[PDB]
Amino acid sequence: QRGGVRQHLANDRKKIVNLNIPFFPLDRSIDRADIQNFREFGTENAPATVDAEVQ
């Protein structure tokens, strides 16, 4: 109503957040015992090799 009390307005809202991150390791090893007397697949009467298993 005219001549009476006024009206008022509010304000906004704010928020903040924090986060972390995970980690993913992976590893495998090699040894002589697996490449000495074994025969490479796909070939015949040929010896295995260390490089092939690394790849």
Added chain:
Amino acid sequence: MQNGDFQILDYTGLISTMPRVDTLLQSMNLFTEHFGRTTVARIERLDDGAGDIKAV
């Protein structure tokens, strides 16, 4: 070579052996060889000698 299916080998060749045979007589040339025509052979022999001479 290949041991089993997944393994390899070292190949060292072959070894051979034969039995003995003796050739002593053939080395002596002790026999004479004749070549005929049929399966039958003939041989002839002759003997001779001497005798006594009594007094007369």
